[PDB]
Design a binder for this molecule. Structure first.
Ligand SMILES: NC(=O)C1=CN([C@@H]2O[C@H](COP(=O)(O)OP(=O)(O)OC[C@H]3O[C@@H](n4cnc5c(N)ncnc54)[C@H](OP(=O)(O)O)[C@@H]3O)[C@@H](O)[C@H]2O)C=CC1
Ligand SMILES: NC(=O)C1=CN([C@@H]2O[C@H](COP(=O)(O)OP(=O)(O)OC[C@H]3O[C@@H](n4cnc5c(N)ncnc54)[C@H](OP(=O)(O)O)[C@@H]3O)[C@@H](O)[C@H]2O)C=CC1
Ligand SMILES: CC(C)[C@H]1COC(=O)N1c1ccnc(N[C@@H](C)c2ccccc2)n1
Ligand SMILES: CC(C)[C@H]1COC(=O)N1c1ccnc(N[C@@H](C)c2ccccc2)n1
Lengths: 398, 399
């Protein structure tokens, strides 16, 4: 088997837990040997360890640079009573990002037989977003926002609003330079890693100081640190006003990175393609990545699975979490064998869908869900078997 | 002719001004007579009156309740050079909106043969936008605070925004008045009742629990005290959504709801700004100002001056009139004018659905680069065809 090296894996919850184990059993473990740092972030085990497993998983990603994560339940009030949780544990994803830093980039997987929301988008678009004290104003009065330098030599007082005719609400927000810089570095690394050009969108016409700082810091870091590496790959970096970016992006064919300063997984859910959207946290050092599906645990399918009904859950996004993590491991290690495997598994997935073997969501995307009949699609396990069979052929032929 | 009553009109600039006159002369005046209160907000008349004609027009709307407005040039540094005018006057639409107040609602015009960005959207969705931050650079370490000082001399309240311990960054403050939020709510309920469609408000009140929670609370309070009964009598409702759920729900919907949001760009990228209409809906439920959501279409106006054939879409400008006229008809219980407004909209939709369209519409079918001259009509050709179809429909209606 391929010697794969150090990968941090995080097990999860409900329907994605099922698919995750299938991915390891049928598509990864038959071909790759991993020095696997495996952490169980299932809700019950987070409860039993008082969420310590989540913090330990994040520490492992930092040490070993490659994380692949299965979808996890984020507790709310009803989860607390469903599992009798000791408390409403915080989102594992927030815990991990707070420890790793970095920027989340989402990317759709595109197949030629599958409609796109914007049909001219024939190459994927990779979108990353940059990730407040608010209060109630009880009645008339001035709200002001002040800055006091550490030396105390000055004191600038900006008027937010003079409320004259009632109360309302107000808020202050901020960003540290370092956070903007990290967002730049991650974005530049994303673009170099994929070999695609990079756009930053802001509303610097309106937030001239706040958003102009994003623009200035991106351009300064580009000029000092990345411009040669971009010109070596014949890619480029530009700023856009968000108004123009949206119009230009919709007239584009795709194949660019879009760093967005002001969600896309919500459009995917509305469109019915969450199972085809992957996600990757990109740390600004360019070394550490955490890959995962953009969707959740798919509870509604899992209740169906629990009741004996047939499930047609799309495993592609979860598969591409593995391939993206392994491809990155291959890049850090110059593992040609691994790189070939990771790429081959992505090709197999797209070839299989493009030959008409797909889950119910993809069939509904072609035909519309009302017109979908059961023979137009495979169920979760049929689809995985077909992918396993096509992966066996593809790897054997080389 | 049909008696129309009192309508405030605002003429405008460049390509829209030319479309504007073709509409009155071919589509409105042959069949309707109006107590028309006209105001010329063309850039020249706006300079030559120190932008006074603009605020007179806004007062006329306040008084007469119905305004219809052509698109107007907003001045920038290149505009002042163009007409050698005396100042970089403010947007006529900002002037108008702070005299009247109220919420801008946008609505696309749908035709069966013109593809939609979301195929399942067969009925229009109406988006209501609430519409000022103070932002600055933080140059180095220090404290950013935001404070509230009551106007009655009582104790100021201080909120820590951030201690910058190393380096600087940026900060800003934002605000919203209860009255603006209450007006937004009223305008939104009014708009949902006039159309007979349910209403959704979207916020992110899970993160900004005080700021956005204020919007959610004001909408709900006002809904219960003054609107729930009238809503339940048109089989519609009001509900609040987190923005994530609202985006998903909306894309799975069929359309036909009001979305109060706490859009133009997507229309421009999709190529459908010519099919996008707008209406300023004041909180009283009596005053509207209707207009195309697009601008003066400068780029086509230049082709018009250089003797080039143009194919600028007039539908959204026509619907400024029809929506203004429909609202004027509802105020006056004028059934004859309500019929004309509705019929001019249906004529417009049907003409397109029969294959007679301007070049942008043809491009939604064939693809932006793939239109040829035989696929569409030019601006004046299209107006004639509307005019002919409008005559035929009004003749066949007296039965
Ligand atoms: N990164 C993470 O760990 C995330 C975890 N979550 C967690 O997931 C749980 C459930 O969240 P929920 O709001 O239902 O969001 P999910 O994304 O889990 O599911 C939402 C809907 O999108 C469709 N969908 C999502 N994934 C697939 C797929 N792989 N194949 C086919 N269809 C798919 C299904 O729609 P349909 O019903 O129409 O088939 C599904 O019901 C929650 O506990 C939440 O905390 C949520 C987001 C991220
Ligand atoms: N409420 C108002 O009065 C508004 C006025 N304006 C003003 O209008 C002027 C021009 O602004 P601009 O940025 O060009 O915005 P416009 O909305 O006038 O035009 C933008 C582009 O969108 C397309 N488009 C818009 N309307 C139509 C239509 N009716 N038929 C066909 N295509 C259309 C055209 O694209 P293509 O180039 O592909 O043909 C046009 O070049 C400015 O002076 C601005 O201040 C702007 C917004 C609102
Ligand atoms: C609309 C989107 C959910 C999917 C479904 O259908 C498409 O055409 N989609 C495409 C097509 C290419 N590239 C993407 N990338 C993602 C990250 C994206 C999300 C949101 C906006 C832009 C871009 N999405
Ligand atoms: C995408 C949009 C520009 C037009 C063009 O294509 C459509 O199918 N569009 C539709 C279809 C129904 N309803 C709308 N309403 C507008 C106000 C809107 C704009 C933006 C978002 C939501 C809703 N737009």
């Amino acid at each position: 088997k391929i010697s794969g090296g150090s990968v941090v894996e995080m097990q999860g919850d409900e329907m994605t837990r099922i698919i995750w184990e299938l991915i390891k059993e049928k598509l990864i473990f038959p071909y790759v040997e991993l020095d696997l740092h495996s952490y169980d972030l299932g809700i019950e085990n987070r409860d039993a360890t008082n969420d310590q497993v989540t913090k330990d998983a994040a520490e492992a990603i930092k040490k070993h640079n490659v994380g692949v994560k299965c979808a996890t339940i984020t507790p709310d009030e009803k989860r607390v009573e469903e599992f009798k949780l000791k408390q409403m544990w915080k989102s594992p994803n927030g815990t991990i990002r707070n420890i790793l830093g970095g920027t989340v980039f989402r990317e759709a997987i595109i197949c030629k037989n599958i409609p796109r929301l914007v049909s001219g988008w024939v190459k994927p678009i990779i979108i990353g977003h940059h990730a407040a004290t608010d209060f109630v104003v009880p009645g008339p009065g001035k709200v002001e926002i002040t800055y006091t330098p550490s030396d105390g030599t000055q004191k600038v007082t900006y008027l937010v609003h003079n409320f004259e005719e009632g109360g309302g609400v107000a808020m202050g927000m901020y960003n540290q330079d370092k956070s903007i810089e990290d967002f730049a570095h991650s974005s530049f690394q994303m673009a170099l890693s994929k070999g695609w050009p990079l756009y930053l969108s802001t509303k610097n016409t309106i937030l001239k100081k706040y958003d102009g700082r994003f623009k200035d810091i991106f351009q300064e870091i580009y000029d000092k640190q990345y411009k040669s590496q971009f010109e070596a790959q014949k890619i480029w970096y530009e700023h856009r006003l968000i108004d123009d970016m949206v119009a230009q992006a919709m007239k584009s064919e795709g194949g660019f990175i879009w760093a967005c300063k002001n969600q896309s997984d919500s459009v995917a859910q509305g469109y019915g393609s969450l199972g085809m959207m992957t996600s990757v946290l990109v740390c600004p050092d360019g070394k550490t990545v955490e890959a995962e599906a953009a969707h959740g645990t798919v509870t509604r399918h899992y209740r169906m699975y629990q009741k004996g009904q047939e499930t047609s859950t799309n495993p592609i996004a979860s598969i591409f979490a593995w391939t993206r993590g392994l491809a990155h491991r291959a890049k850090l290690d110059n593992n040609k064998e691994l790189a070939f495997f990771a790429n081959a598994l992505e090709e197999v997935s797209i070839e299989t869908i493009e030959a008409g073997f797909m889950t119910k969501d993809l069939a509904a995307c072609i035909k519309g869900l009302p017109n979908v009949q059961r023979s137009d699609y495979l169920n979760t396990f049929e689809f995985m078997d077909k992918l396993g069979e096509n992966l066996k052929i593809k790897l054997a032929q080389a």
